[PDB]
Amino acid sequence: EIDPKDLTFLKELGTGQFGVVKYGKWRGQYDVAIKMIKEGSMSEDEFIEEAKVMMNLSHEKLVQLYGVCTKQRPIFIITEYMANGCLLNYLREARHAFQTQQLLEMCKDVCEAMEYLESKQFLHRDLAARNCLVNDQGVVKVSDFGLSRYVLDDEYTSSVGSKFPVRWSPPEVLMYSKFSSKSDIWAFGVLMWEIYSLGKMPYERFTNSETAEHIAQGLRLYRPHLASAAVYTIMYSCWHEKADERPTFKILLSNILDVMDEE
Numbered sequence: 001e002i003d004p005k006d007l008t009f010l011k012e013l014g015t016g017q018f019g020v021v022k023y024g025k026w027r028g029q030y031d032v033a034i035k036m037i038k039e040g041s042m043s044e045d046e047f048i049e050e051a052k053v054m055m056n057l058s059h060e061k062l063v064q065l066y067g068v069c070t071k072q073r074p075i076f077i078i079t080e081y082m083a084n085g086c087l088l089n090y091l092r093e094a095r096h097a098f099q100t101q102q103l104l105e106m107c108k109d110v111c112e113a114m115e116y117l118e119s120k121q122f123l124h125r126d127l128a129a130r131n132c133l134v135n136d137q138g139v140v141k142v143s144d145f146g147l148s149r150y151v152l153d154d155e156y157t158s159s160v161g162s163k164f165p166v167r168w169s170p171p172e173v174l175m176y177s178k179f180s181s182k183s184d185i186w187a188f189g190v191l192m193w194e195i196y197s198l199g200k201m202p203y204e205r206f207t208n209s210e211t212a213e214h215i216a217q218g219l220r221l222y223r224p225h226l227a228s229a230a231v232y233t234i235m236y237s238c239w240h241e242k243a244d245e246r247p248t249f250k251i252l253l254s255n256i257l258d259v260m261d262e263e
């Protein structure tokens with residue numbers, strides 16, 4: 001529990017599923033992001049119980065939870081500040097002029113975080129470049145893992161809804177609501193595609209409904225030009241129709257390291 005007397009509110013960072021997010025300082029020294037949770041957007045009591053366990057997730061490629069302010073409304077969630085913002089918009093700026101080793105290193109940063117969550121049996125359920133952040137050193141970290149469970153908006157939580165992450169979801173989630181470790185593995189392969197495509201929308205010429213149809217029939221995202229055959233094999237292994245045939249994050253990490261040594 002953070003005392004809100006120790007917070008300042010300095011700049012607006014944007015709006016997400018739970019409303020406004022601000023940049024500020026904690027104890028007049030530490031940069032933070034402050035999620036000011038909008039009324040009616042979150043299952044707050046359930047989150048508060050879960051914050052207790054989320055306080056114990058700590059890994060250098062996971063955005064760090066610093067605390068919460070819950071003796072009040074709105075409630076606040078206080079996290080590590082990531083100066084370069086979301087990975088999706090970062091990938092789309094042509095000025096960075098990324099080398100392919102930098103793109104693989106972004107995939108590796110996210111896979112390390114995901115291997116740590118897998119080790120804790122903890123699902124993200126919305127892994128995508130819009131939900132990863134980049135710090136001032138260009139390190140990518142995974143954000144808002146596990147928070148999908150507390151979203152009140154039916155347009156986000158229904159697999160037929162307008163905000164559901166259709167293009168990052170495997171066929172068994174779309175058809176059957178079958179969530180597992182393997183549904184995050186599928187999203188991870190889509191996130192590698194987003195990285196190697198410099199932030200294009202997956203299935204860029206299709207709607208969500210058409211994408212759901214395409215992937216249940218076996219078709220997959222094409223190889224981005226910047227991906228080698230070896231990088232494409234890694235992302236494509238995440239898309240096996242049989243969930244049990246998809247790798248684990250531990251296996252993907254070893255794959256990514258072997259390709260970095262190769263390239």
Ligand SMILES: Cn1c2c(cc(Nc3ccc(C(=O)N4CCOCC4)cn3)c1=O)-c1cccc(-n3ncc4cc(C(C)(C)C)cc(F)c4c3=O)c1C[C@H](O)C2
Nearest residue numbers: 013014015016017018021033081082083084085144147148
């Ligand atoms: C830390 N942190 C979070 C943010 C943003 C952060 N940092 C920055 C830093 C710089 C800039 C900037 O303006 N520029 C200008 C151009 O050059 C690049 C830099 C913007 N943001 C940050 O450190 C955030 C904000 C809004 C919304 C969200 N957001 N995103 C996904 C999301 C997803 C979900 C789910 C549950 C639907 C999955 C739930 C959510 F509440 C959110 C959510 O609040 C976040 C990200 C982070 O939460 C805070």
